[PDB]
């Protein structure tokens, strides 16, 4: 049923409108869900490709990345969703829109209480990267016709705004995007939105915690016993910060949620630190780096993603698993699990003392922990798992798409409920 669903000119996505970045959860070819994010980002652009351009052609030949497809994102978007002017002109969109002078972004007046995403100043901030995250995707599956039944959400605030039939009325309706450049130049894709739901932020993540969709079958991800009714923290822990967020009734709490500076931040860089200070007592290091200021490692995003991701990874398949972090600066090894495993103690031990503390002062009856900071405090986290009613998803590798994913899957209950 799902293979005949999939099969026909169509494209089962969910949406997810943030200020910084839109992302996409879809099903794919193999019925697996898919995502990206394209940051909200764009630039006026020239009707048809243009020949100077910011590096040479081949440069990609030489690189070991994913979605390169939104790399480059000059494309030219018709709908009635966007204005005349907006809608005669191409656009860069996304990472490519960064390296403009004139590049568009959100902001947030008069100080920093943020802005309304669909009022007509904004709107086209957010519906051309929405729309161009559906063209990937459909070009992605080689189709060039869908029909986009459109699962999106919105906080709560906007409730007082707008209306859910509002947006998806702005939604309705036929969009083209045509893509310039790039790895699908010269195709066109023709959006079809006749229907669609909207869903409510935040407490809609349970579903990408509870569910996942594998080759076409919704299955239930082991880790969450939930009964209906029930109130739920989540913990979104992040480089900077830390939000914790308490859902009673299918509502967020206002006066119990809250957000703090416990970040991964500053227990990565005391790791950094201590990792020079190991190599500077290797010998070879003090033959040739001595009072200098270079460090194996570029940023906190380099050192997660290729010193603690794999072996992080290995330790969520397997609880038997024993973590090894080497690092090579150059010819040069050094085991340095006891400088990562410290930091990472250390950081779960003060989330442990946030996440207690807020599981009494809401009595949250399912205490969810999300985010980057799972992964990076996964060796001590796992330990609450002994608490009954704390939650450490499975999949917590996808928590960036936890709410694309969960639009996603009440869209595929959606089209299954129609039969």
Same mark, same amino acid.
């Given at each position: 049923?799902?293979?005949?669903?999939?099969?026909?000119?169509?494209?089962?996505?969910?949406?997810?409108?943030?200020?910084?970045?839109?992302?996409?959860?879809?099903?794919?070819?193999?019925?697996?869900?898919?995502?990206?994010?394209?940051?909200?980002?764009?630039?006026?652009?020239?009707?048809?490709?243009?020949?100077?351009?910011?590096?040479?052609?081949?440069?990609?030949?030489?690189?070991?990345?994913?979605?390169?497809?939104?790399?480059?994102?000059?494309?030219?978007?018709?709908?009635?969703?966007?204005?005349?002017?907006?809608? $005669?002109?191409?656009?860069?969109? &996304?990472?490519?829109?960064? *390296?403009?002078?004139? %590049?568009? =972004?959100?902001?947030?007046? /008069? @100080?920093?209480?943020?802005?309304?995403?669909?009022?007509?100043?904004?709107?086209?901030?957010?519906?051309?990267?929405?729309?161009?995250?559906?063209?990937?995707?459909?070009?992605?599956?080689?189709?060039?016709?869908? $029909?986009?039944?459109?699962?999106? &959400?919105?906080?709560?605030? *906007?409730?007082?705004? %707008?209306? =859910?039939?509002?947006?998806? /009325? @702005?939604?309705?309706?036929?969009?083209?995007?045509?893509?310039?450049?790039?790895?699908?130049?010269?195709?066109?894709?023709?959006?079809?939105?006749?229907?669609?739901?909207?869903?409510?932020?935040?407490?809609?993540?349970?579903?990408?915690?509870?569910?996942?969709?594998?080759?076409?079958?919704?299955?239930?991800?082991?880790?969450?016993?939930?009964?209906?009714?029930?109130?739920?923290?989540?913990?979104?822990?992040?480089?900077?910060?830390?939000?914790?967020?308490?859902?009673?009734?299918?509502?967020?709490?206002?006066?119990?949620?809250?957000?703090?500076?416990?970040?991964?931040?500053?227990?990565?860089?005391?790791?950094?630190?201590?990792?020079?200070?190991?190599?500077?007592?290797?010998?070879?290091?003090?033959?040739?780096?001595?009072?200098?200021?270079?460090?194996?490692?570029?940023?906190?995003?380099?050192?997660?993603?290729?010193?603690?991701?794999?072996?992080?990874?290995?330790?969520?398949?397997?609880?038997?698993?024993?973590?090894?972090?080497?690092?090579?600066?150059?010819?040069?090894?050094?085991?340095?699990?006891?400088?990562?495993?410290?930091?990472?103690?250390?950081?779960?031990?003060?989330?442990?003392?946030?996440?207690?503390?807020?599981?009494?002062?809401?009595?949250?009856?399912?205490?969810?922990?999300?985010?980057?900071?799972?992964?990076?405090?996964?060796?001590?986290?796992?330990?609450?798992?002994?608490?009954?009613?704390?939650?450490?998803?499975?999949?917590?590798?996808?928590?960036?798409?936890?709410?694309?994913?969960?639009?996603?899957?009440?869209?595929?209950?959606?089209?299954?409920?129609?039969?």
């Amino acid at each position: 049923m799902v293979e005949q669903m999939l099969s026909k000119n169509m494209l089962l996505g969910g949406f997810d409108t943030g200020n910084i970045k839109a992302k996409i959860s879809f099903l794919n070819e193999k019925g697996n869900i898919e995502s990206f994010a394209i940051p909200t980002v764009i630039a006026e652009a020239p009707p048809a490709k243009i020949d100077l351009k910011s590096a040479p052609s081949k440069k990609n030949d030489y690189v070991n990345e994913k979605d390169e497809d939104i790399e480059l994102l000059h494309v030219r978007i018709i709908s009635n969703s966007l204005d005349g002017d907006a809608r $005669s002109r191409a656009w860069y969109v &996304g990472a490519y829109a960064k *390296d403009q002078e004139d %590049r568009q =972004e959100p902001t947030v007046d /008069e @100080m920093g209480k943020t802005e309304d995403k669909f009022s007509q100043k904004n709107k086209k901030l957010h519906l051309i990267p929405l729309f161009t995250s559906m063209a990937v995707a459909a070009a992605r599956i080689g189709k060039e016709e869908v $029909s986009v039944p459109f699962s999106g &959400g919105m906080p709560i605030e *906007d409730y007082k705004l %707008r209306g =859910e039939e509002q947006i998806l /009325e @702005m939604l309705y309706g036929e969009h083209t995007v045509e893509f310039l450049d790039g790895t699908y130049e010269g195709k066109k894709i023709k959006i079809t939105i006749n229907d669609g739901t909207m869903n409510v932020e935040g407490v809609s993540s349970v579903l990408a915690i509870l569910f996942d969709i594998v080759n076409g079958e919704i299955v239930e991800v082991e880790g969450m016993d939930a009964e209906i009714g029930e109130s739920y923290a989540i913990n979104d822990l992040g480089a900077g910060t830390s939000d914790n967020a308490f859902f009673e009734d299918g509502e967020l709490n206002k006066k119990l949620s809250t957000n703090t500076d416990l970040g991964t931040n500053k227990y990565i860089d005391e790791i950094l630190k201590n990792i020079k200070e190991r190599f500077m007592e290797n010998e070879i290091l003090k033959s040739f780096m001595t009072d200098e200021i270079e460090s194996p490692f570029k940023t906190r995003e380099d050192f997660i993603q290729r010193l603690v991701m794999p072996e992080v990874e290995k330790m969520i398949e397997d609880d038997t698993y024993k973590p090894t972090f080497s690092v090579k600066w150059g010819p040069v090894k050094e085991n340095v699990t006891d400088i990562v495993m410290d930091g990472m103690l250390k950081y779960a031990e003060d989330q442990k003392a946030s996440l207690m503390k807020f599981w009494f002062k809401t009595n949250a009856d399912k205490n969810i922990v999300v985010g980057g900071g799972v992964l990076f405090g996964y060796a001590g986290l796992r330990d609450l798992k002994e608490q009954d009613g704390f939650i450490l998803p499975k999949n917590i590798q996808e928590s960036a798409y936890f709410t694309s994913r969960s639009y996603l899957i009440a869209n595929l209950l959606e089209q299954l409920n129609k039969e």
